[PDB]
């Protein structure tokens, strides 16, 4: 909270332990390309709310030949039209796309990975070998949680980072700890990530005031003020960010602190009280 630099934007979990990868993804581009080349398929995990911002530009710029399956989490939070258009784009492309809610990303993603391997992935020359999928994604999105769950399952069964999925068709996943971390980011990207909740807000680096002001600005630009007012339950549509904060404080209670009432729009945005998205694309 008080501390300025956000840890989740730099930290991940390797086999040895926590590490702080530094620099931009273009530096790792070469290592990522080598990892994908030595792997068999690619499993990319991204956030449906800001897909093109969560994804790794170097991966899409360098490797397109290897089969890739993208898992957009928080699909219900994300807008439907954008999801459908990007899904059609990926279907036209050689990759595959799958939009998942909480439980879907929990287990249906593994089920879909197994289906993908069985259906499209070619058959190996041997049987004891394993089909390897390089996992690329930001740890806070859910890639880290999935890797940890698989690690725990394998450790219980027994009782480089490769985690098995299922005995048949012998699927394993390579871990990429710090190849797609945000690190240093632009102001707009940081605001988008903070609004999405993937980067905790701080009182110094990026205040909740600025985050909520950005959210209100994007909503007003979209022209959804009345719907936002109805969702927030406040009586009349606001005219300014300060007016919205005052209305929220009044609704909450007489002794409604400005910061306390400003914290509520961010929680609502994270909890899907409003359905929106932050990201551009090309055709």
């Amino acid at each position: 909270s008080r501390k300025g630099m956000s840890r989740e934007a730099f930290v991940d979990i390797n086999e040895k332990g926590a590490a702080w990868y530094l620099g931009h993804m273009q530096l790792a581009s070469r290592t990522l390309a080598e990892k994908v080349k030595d792997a068999d398929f690619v499993l990319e995990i991204r956030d449906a709310r800001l897909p093109f911002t969560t994804g790794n530009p170097n991966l899409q710029k360098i490797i397109i030949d290897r089969p890739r399956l993208i898992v957009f989490n928080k699909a219900e939070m994300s807008n439907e039209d954008c999801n459908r258009v990007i899904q059609q784009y990926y279907e036209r492309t050689g990759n595959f796309a799958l939009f998942t809610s909480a439980k879907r990303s929990w287990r249906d993603t593994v089920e879909a990975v197994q289906r993908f391997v069985t259906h499209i992935l070619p058959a190996q020359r041997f049987k004891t070998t394993a089909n390897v999928g390089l996992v690329v994604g930001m740890p806070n999105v859910g890639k880290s949680t999935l890797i940890n769950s698989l690690r725990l399952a394998h450790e219980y069964q027994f009782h480089v980072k490769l985690v098995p999925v299922c005995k048949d068709p012998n699927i394993v996943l390579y871990d990429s700890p710090g190849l797609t971390l945000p690190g240093c980011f632009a102001k707009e990207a940081g605001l988008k990530l903070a609004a999405c909740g993937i980067i905790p807000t701080n009182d110094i680096t990026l205040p909740r005031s600025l985050v909520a002001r950005y959210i209100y600005d994007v909503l007003s630009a979209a022209g959804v003020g009345e719907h936002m007012a109805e969702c927030l339950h406040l009586p009349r549509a606001p005219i300014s960010f300060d007016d919205c904060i005052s209305m929220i404080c009044e609704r909450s209670g007489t002794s409604g602190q400005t910061d306390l009432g400003n914290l509520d729009p961010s929680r609502a945005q994270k909890f899907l009280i409003h359905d929106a998205q932050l990201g551009n694309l090309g055709r």
């Binding site: 931009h24 807008n79 439907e80 039209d81 240093c184 980011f185 632009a186 102001k187 707009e188 990207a189 600005d217 994007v218 909503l219 630009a221 979209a222 959804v224 719907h227 109805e230 969702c231 899907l272 009280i273 409003h274 359905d275 929106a276 998205q277 932050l278 551009n280």
Partner: protein
């Protein structure tokens, strides 16, 4: 409410080449390059042509 979809116009999104969109590292690097070139112009360095004024 939640089921209702919201479409964000491209106008609100910042321009691709905007300094806000560009990471701060690139902006600092360009500023420091400009400062170094100014210093080289101020003190006569080898291979430095005084093509400017003032």
């Amino acid at each position: 409410p939640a089921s209702r979809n919201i479409v964000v116009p491209d106008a609100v999104h910042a321009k691709v080449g905007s300094p806000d969109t560009l990471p701060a590292e690139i902006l600092q690097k360009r500023a420091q390059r400009a400062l170094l070139m100014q210093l080289q112009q101020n003190v006569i360095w080898e291979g430095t042509v005084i093509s400017d004024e003032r």
